[PDB]
Design a protein around this ligand. Structure first.
Ligand SMILES: *Cc1cc2c(cc1C)nc1c(=O)[nH]c(=O)nc-1n2C[C@H](O)[C@H](O)[C@H](O)COP(=O)(O)OP(=O)(O)OC[C@H]1O[C@@H](n2cnc3c(N)ncnc32)[C@H](O)[C@@H]1O
Ligand SMILES: *Cc1cc2c(cc1C)nc1c(=O)[nH]c(=O)nc-1n2C[C@H](O)[C@H](O)[C@H](O)COP(=O)(O)OP(=O)(O)OC[C@H]1O[C@@H](n2cnc3c(N)ncnc32)[C@H](O)[C@@H]1O
Ligand SMILES: *Cc1cc2c(cc1C)nc1c(=O)[nH]c(=O)nc-1n2C[C@H](O)[C@H](O)[C@H](O)COP(=O)(O)OP(=O)(O)OC[C@H]1O[C@@H](n2cnc3c(N)ncnc32)[C@H](O)[C@@H]1O
Ligand SMILES: C/C=C/c1ccc(O)c(OC)c1
Ligand SMILES: C/C=C/c1ccc(O)c(OC)c1
Ligand SMILES: C/C=C/c1ccc(O)c(OC)c1
Lengths: 550, 550, 550
């Protein structure tokens, strides 16, 4: 196809068309689509930002291409290297809040890996792990195991929603809420197509499975892996694996995620904290608990509007357009039988063990006036506890997409700085976030996910995508929170297309040595600057900073 | 469009056409025109030299392109860099006498910035300045202020005519006749598109106006400027601004010109000097006056033929074809009640102050036998004083285009060397200019504009554009005056396309170190040699001097 | 000489010594000195920062070399190019508050130009200008004129002190208080030695003075300049002059400074403003006054501690260590018969004219309750008016060095942002400055110098150089003021070695395009990076930003 909406830098119409036709000879017109529509979460767009804050066609594909197999990606990349055409790889494209599917460089080809490179590749019981392709969604994976009755043997770890990509999410350093919740740390043995087009597999993946009759003549992509590939991540020598989480260093075609065995015993719970400032005490109680392993999963402390919005849009709680009051927040908390902050956790294991931990937790949190403990059974049919009970045992659900509907054309955009597991730090962080929210005219909504020694504070910005005035406030709000948090010694762990440069400019110790070192590795492996110029603010040398920085 | 009259160096027909069509996709065929007609001053040509001395198609565009906005110029430049196509930027193209609109390199695209980048951008009263685009003509600016009733608060400074470009004129280091008459020195905060295509704003323009809700997501071009941008020119560090007056270092898209507040009191005047050699005494009287601030504007000493020709063509004063005589010049001076040289000035400010200065001036000039003082009121309806009275208070007029009609197909070409504010120097300069004029068979016509310590001597050459014999004498006359004045220690301040190289070769102290240093800066910023190769004789390294020097 | 304290980057001891000995063969051991002592203002150090805020040997020379003539500099530069040795040129080295004489890169050779290149080259009366060499101090120039009885014909323009370099101060874009107070704008015709070592003279200086018997065979440096060199700055073509104010693009060996004729009438004056908050109304009164030319020089608005400290150290007004109070500030103003802010001006010209202006001014300022008008005659023997009366008429004095003695080991360090000529802006600027000052434990002391449309706010930081706790507070103070003023849309006009980078990172509009463009010109003209790496933050490409940025 003929004439796109936006072309990639330095490319002519003539070169594009030659390339697209060459791409078509390889994947079929069935697998190619040229932009000459936001969609939903259940059927996600792939050409632009569905939760757009910039104009909606600001980060816009010139085409969507989707490989049949690993060999298609080799050929595509060769073709990108002939013409110098940028590729923006996706797995599912469910990254809304962070850019969705859009490419940082308008005009790139979005490479949809998920459409055809779909397969649950292996579910190994004794090593308790699985090998997945970009397309295996969490739901699918769930369903794979149900299909073979493996769910009494192995469990998954899922995010809040169930449609994301196990792989895609894992390269983003995404979080989940069971003991295996730190997705990135659960991996082992990834297969990459680099910017020169060669296929590499990390760690024990570089150790060839030995020759045998049945595996002769297979294309690299399709060979088995040696026994230890997905059991020990390190391999030998430099542990390059991390260079492929949040970066532009290659295209990931396989990945091993470790799976948590059935623990033989489970139970969710909800601790509710009455007062807005019970967050400080709450968190100080959580410090030793997490660090001491009484708290086994990644328990989350939710804000009250986060739970309220799951249950209903704001219109349903007030007709008021400006942020809610302190008093109304108490009144809504009381309505749902939730407190001002709500702590969510799960206990895992034999009853004897579960019993002791729970008693220890229960007693710790009893030090807060008015706290109330609930299991799933004790809460309304529609409660968040019953949704998270699914979530905290590896079952994917979609119930939590509703809070995105807080306001009319609800779009979320996440501000995600990390905080100490300490009441003071937390209050400080929230104190600053909260202020900016009310200056912009936005309800504050969020969650802290409790990591071992750190907390990921997901400030959940919901806004009206069809409101120019508001979109301008969020951009104002986001960059002001970047600066503020920066100024308090906190930085974001993950972000949106339009905030990457500002967040990478936050990580400037010793004159931005960190980004400088990254540019060296990027330009080395990608001489042409073809694999996603811009991710995490790393620009190859052919993208002038003055022209491309946001 | 298909096949041009003259193409740019090294370019093929095939490359041109690809480029022009690419340009058309960006600006629309509405904004592009291919040369496959001299026009007037009120409707100026843009493809060649309207006051041509060389063949009329000697400096000829291959196309005229005109951007919609700043982003169009970025894209155009990118395209010039792909194909190595020379761009010859204009604002209005009213430079006749200096080349008009034509490009030094035949075959370049004339980039008409004035057609669409038209806007009076800001008229700030308290800082007393304005921010204008290439297209704001002087007349327009005048009219902007009338439209908002700002003319009792702020005044302009205009050239002799009112159609020029405030910006265009200001980058040429053009002159005007009020206290703000040194156009270039009145600026502060320019926005440039360089040869690599990046947008830069000078001085305090590099100091970002801080983030606020209402200005989020604007394209660089369109962001506000910080408070001090147009009040302090210097900024911090190297003061690059001058690199963009008379040069090929970038394309200027905005500019701040300082505006002179209503002074609360005004009055023009005409001092007439009888004798041709009263110029020497006159100027010696002006020395201390200017330097002492009794003379506040840029008073001009006009030749008698300059004033005579404003009133009528030469046919109206004599039928004679050869230059007029000394005796006839007296007779024409007496006819109009003007002397042989005529001094024009204006007093600005409270009456008390005006009173004292005028008395001081009056008394100084009384030392010349026969001198006569006139205000506007005292002169015929059609007098030059009444035209300049407009001019010296910031009101643009066009009355003075008539002297261009001295001879039949009247074309002016300016020889503009600078002289000392000293009678001797002046007489010398005039003595040499005058001789050459009569050797070529041309009346001598001119004006000295009195700067603080220097005088700009505009020798006003009028000639018949449809007379090959004469055009050959002017070329002879111009280069001979270049050599002569050079040999007397004087150089031109500004010139025509065909005289640039000879004038830049006049500024050869220490083996042309000055031009050598400039070539280094040019080749550095413009690797491809795309922005107007040749302006002021600076040639990028891909334009062999042997091939391109005139 | 043998083994220095700090060497320049990448240089060996063996290369150094070869270079220094080669330098000795050209200038003599008499003109060379190797560092293997702060001094005073009257006898200034040249190896480091006398007003140090960083360790006192932080910016430290490796040697001091001083050329005999211009050829010495051509040879030195050649040698720096052979060995890649950085040169830090100075004229006098009296830049304390801004780094003194110290080089941004430790280990450079400080090039003292002032020791031997001393001469008032020409004092031309009819063109009313002078040509000076690095060494001509203001006091010398003053003295040159008295020696020939030129002071009844031409006057100078001087900063607060008289020891500075007319040239050096003029290239730093320094200020003075008569009608010629904008030093840089008064220049015309500079001679530079570039990084490649060729000698270039700007503007009309490129226009050779014509051959004559008496000037045959002269070395370029020593030839005469053509008549218009020092009368018209522009010349022809690109106006490169500004590339040499606050930059690393060449070594300045000569410069023309225009001189203000005797105006025939002078009178100083002091308007005192009672209340701290009468600055806002004062400044509003000044707006139209400056803009209207009733205010003819650069009248300064001084703080009350600026005046008090001239008269005495703080010990003399209080024994208190922390910043004074509001009430004590009133008590000290009342003591000296000064108000809380004090405005200093001068009227210039025929009495008739002076009379009118002064009445206008007097009447304007009468709008402030309690204001009092004083001429020199009416103030104590030791008053600031009597010092400034010298100052505003071109006479250099040193009385004002005393405020530097506010505290024990008094060192000044200037914070110099620019502000609008508007009360509101002024107060805002002062409100922010003032807060920071008291947070760090320092009296606020400053002066606004009133430009036409802008004000230079010189916040006068005095601190104890022998107090590590305090030096750390001023570095904290200085970078906090940079940030704050930056966030309020104000940037500094000039600064100290250690604040360059941060101030150049403040002028980052459109992704630092302004600095990027300067790096291209810098690397182009200085392939080896030898002339003063770092001035104004511009680092040639062999100085990694991660290694050298502060
Ligand atoms: C809206 C939202 C998002 C969300 C969430 C809750 C809501 C309401 N809860 C999350 C959670 O609890 N934990 C978490 O980590 N993320 C959460 N999200 C964010 C996102 O919606 C989900 O995380 C989702 O799984 C992320 O998107 P998905 O995995 O589907 O989609 P993606 O666009 O493909 O993103 C992958 C990005 O990583 C690179 N990439 C991806 N695949 C590859 C391959 N094969 N090779 C190379 N690079 C790859 C790219 O950078 C890409 O943009
Ligand atoms: C015929 C004539 C000319 C004239 C004059 C009187 C007469 C009878 N009186 C003048 C005067 O009193 N003072 C003066 O400075 N010039 C006078 N002129 C000359 C000219 O006609 C006017 O000065 C007029 O304003 C100049 O032309 P104008 O401003 O309209 O037109 P221009 O062709 O655009 O010229 C600009 C040139 O500068 C560069 N340029 C211009 N704009 C840009 C932008 N945006 N970016 C980059 N470069 C730019 C080019 O070099 C261009 O050719
Ligand atoms: C302590 C003080 C300082 C001061 C002042 C009052 C006091 C009490 N009042 C000032 C004022 O009213 N206006 C002003 O501009 N400055 C004022 N100062 C600051 C300083 O002391 C004086 O301004 C003084 O004139 C500045 O120093 P000076 O001219 O003597 O000395 P310098 O070290 O040479 O500094 C020049 C710097 O510029 C570059 N430079 C200098 N010369 C060259 C040459 N030839 N070529 C290339 N670069 C040059 C360097 O960056 C150098 O460090
Ligand atoms: C649940 C919400 C959420 C959103 C984005 C994230 O990156 C995240 O990880 C802790 C959590
Ligand atoms: C009036 C005539 C004129 C023409 C060309 C110039 O460049 C100029 O400037 C002083 C003046
Ligand atoms: C008087 C003080 C002063 C100090 C440093 C400067 O740079 C300056 O320039 C306006 C003025």
């Amino acid at each position: 196809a003929f004439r796109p909406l936006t072309l990639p830098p330095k490319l002519s119409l003539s070169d594009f068309n030659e390339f697209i036709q060459d791409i078509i000879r390889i994947v079929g017109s069935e697998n190619v689509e040229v932009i000459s529509v936001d969609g939903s979460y259940m059927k996600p767009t792939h050409t632009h930002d569905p939760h757009h804050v910039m104009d909606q066609d600001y980060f816009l594909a010139s085409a969507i291409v989707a490989p049949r197999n690993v060999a298609d990606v080799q050929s595509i990349v060769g073709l990108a290297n002939k013409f110098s055409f940028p590729l923006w790889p996706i797995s599912i494209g469910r990254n809304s809040g962070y850019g969705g599917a859009a490419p940082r460089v308008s005009g790139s080809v979005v490479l949809d890996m998920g459409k055809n490179m779909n397969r649950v590749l292996e579910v190994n019981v004794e090593g308790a792990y699985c090998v997945v392709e970009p397309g295996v969604t969490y739901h699918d994976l769930h369903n794979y195991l149900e299909a073979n009755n493996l769910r009494d043997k192995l469990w998954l770890d899922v995010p809040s929603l169930g449609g994301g990509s196990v792989l895609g999410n894992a390269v983003e350093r995404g979080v989940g809420y069971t003991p295996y919740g730190d997705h990135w740390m659960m991996h082992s043995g990834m297969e990459v197509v680099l910017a020169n087009g060669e296929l590499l597999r990390t760690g024990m993946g570089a150790l060839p499975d030995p020759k045998r009759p049945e595996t002769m003549g297979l294309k690299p992509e399709d060979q088995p892996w040696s026994k230890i590939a997905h059991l020990f991540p390190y391999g030998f020598g430099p542990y390059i694996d991390g260079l492929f989480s949040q970066s532009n260093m290659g295209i990931v075609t396989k990945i091993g995620i470790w799976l948590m065995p059935n623990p033989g015993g489970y139970q969710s719970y909800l601790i509710t904290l009455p007062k807005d400032g019970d967050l400080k005490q709450a968190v100080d109680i959580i410090r030793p608990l997490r660090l001491g392993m009484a708290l086994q999963n990644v328990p989350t402390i939710r804000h009250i509007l986060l739970d309220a919005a799951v249950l209903g849009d704001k219109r349903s709680y007030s007709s008021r357009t400006e942020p809610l009051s302190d008093e109304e927040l108490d009144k809504i908390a009381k309505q749902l039988n939730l407190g001002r902050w709500n702590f969510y956790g799960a206990l895992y294991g034999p009853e004897p063990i579960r019993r002791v931990l729970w008693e220890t937790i229960k007693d710790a949190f009893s030090a807060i006036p008015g706290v109330k403990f609930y299991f799933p059974e004790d809460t309304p049919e529609n409660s968040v506890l019953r949704v998270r009970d699914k979530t905290m045992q590896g079952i994917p659900t979609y119930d939590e997409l509703k809070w995105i509907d807080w306001l009319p054309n609800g779009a979320h955009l996440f501000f995600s700085p990390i905080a100490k597991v300490s009441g003071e730090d937390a209050m400080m962080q929230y104190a600053v976030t909260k202020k900016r929210c009310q200056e912009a005219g936005l309800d504050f909504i969020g969650t802290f996910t409790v990591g071992m020694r750190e907390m990921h504070h997901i400030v959940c910005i919901v806004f009206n995508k069809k409101d120019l005035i508001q979109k301008r406030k969020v951009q104002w709000l986001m960059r002001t929170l970047i600066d503020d948090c920066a100024a308090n010694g906190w930085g974001e762990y993950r972000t949106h297309l339009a905030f990457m440069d500002q967040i990478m400019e936050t990580y400037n110790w010793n004159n931005s040595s960190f980004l400088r070192f990254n540019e060296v590795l990027k330009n080395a492996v990608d001489p042409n600057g073809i694999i996603a110029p811009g991710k995490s603010g790393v620009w190859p040398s052919q993208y002038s900073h003055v022209t491309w920085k946001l």
